[PDB]
């Protein structure tokens, strides 16, 4: 028969837009950014099933802003908890912008 069609959802693009707008301030003020605190504060704004995607996208946006000078110290970072049910994150603080 004749060909049917199906459409995509843009929810994740919208999510990326909110996160990038919310995060732009850190660069502009060159404020030190800690992934642990930011993830813990930002996951509280969405329900549990969506946390994983939010974490991924937030990390994608955050890593573009500068580097963490501690990485050259030879000292590994710890696994910080960011919500209940037991999710963890590992990252040094971002200092060099």
């Amino acid at each position: 028969l004749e060909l049917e069609y199906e459409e995509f959802s843009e929810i994740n693009d919208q999510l990326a837009a909110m996160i990038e707008k919310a995060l732009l301030v850190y660069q502009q003020e060159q404020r030190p950014l800690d992934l642990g605190a930011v993830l813990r504060d930002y996951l509280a704004q969405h329900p549990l099933p969506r946390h994983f995607d939010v974490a991924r996208i937030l990390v994608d946006q955050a890593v573009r802003l500068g580097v963490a000078e501690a990485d050259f110290s030879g000292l590994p970072a710890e696994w910080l908890a960011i919500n209940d049910y037991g999710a963890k994150v590992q990252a040094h603080v971002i200092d060099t912008y």
Binding site: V59, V63, Y85
Partner: protein, 233 residues
């Protein structure tokens, strides 16, 4: 002499067939595209089956060739094997070596890999007759077969309270669809076997640990920024 050798060979063959049959069951109902199962097909070569039967029951017809002290046992085995299937040729190699070949049980077995594809029955696994994902999945299946066999082999040389580690890789994992990845995760989990997979972000498996990589230039030198996530689910 004679019958007892046949019995030890038969029991060794039987034990190998049974162990393979046990390994075989763990791979039932694995979904990889249109492939739905994998097997290791084990069979006995005819030219050796008849030899084994003759050595079992017609020994009085050939005892001259066995008790002749001018030649050794392995030579006797080689000469009997040439007496049967006379069309076989020998490549100017010592009969001693052919005898020792007949003494090794593995030479009696024929081995194949088969897959239960789609509407069809069991087919021999040929790379050219499969899609990409089906080929990758079948490869993983055979690899876990090998690992299980090797662990069973060595345990008689290891401490009673030691269980070796098991780990395998997969590069360019984006080539597999979600259903195939679910199947692969189920297999490795049931086999207590660790996995490390690389994908250019196209796949986001919820279970396990994830590492985000970004390469940059810093003080005129290449540097990799790394972030990690885990615990979801």
């Amino acid at each position: 002499s004679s019958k007892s050798v046949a019995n030890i060979i038969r029991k060794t063959i039987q034990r190998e067939q049974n162990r393979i049959r046990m390994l075989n069951q763990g791979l039932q109902a694995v979904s990889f595209g249109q492939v739905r199962g994998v097997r290791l097909n084990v069979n006995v070569r005819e030219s050796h089956a008849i030899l084994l039967d003759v050595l079992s029951e017609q020994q009085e017809q050939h005892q001259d060739l066995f008790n002749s002290q001018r030649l050794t046992f392995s030579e006797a085995m080689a000469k009997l094997y040439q007496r049967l299937n006379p069309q076989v040729d020998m490549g100017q190699r010592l009969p001693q070596t052919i005898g020792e070949e007949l003494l090794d049980y593995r030479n009696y077995l024929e081995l194949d890999v088969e897959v239960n594809r789609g509407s069809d029955g069991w087919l021999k696994a040929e790379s050219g007759a499969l899609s990409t994902g089906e080929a990758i999945g079948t490869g993983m299946s055979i690899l876990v077969m090998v690992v299980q066999s090797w662990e069973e082999e060595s345990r008689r040389l290891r401490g009673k309270d030691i269980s070796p580690c098991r780990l395998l890789f997969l590069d360019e994992a984006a080539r597999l669809d979600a259903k195939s990845i679910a199947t692969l995760f189920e297999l490795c989990e049931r086999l207590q076997m660790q996995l490390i997979i690389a994908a250019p972000e196209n796949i986001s498996p919820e279970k396990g640990t994830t590492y985000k990589l970004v390469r940059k230039v810093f003080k005129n030198h290449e540097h990799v920024h790394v972030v990690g996530l885990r615990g979801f689910g």
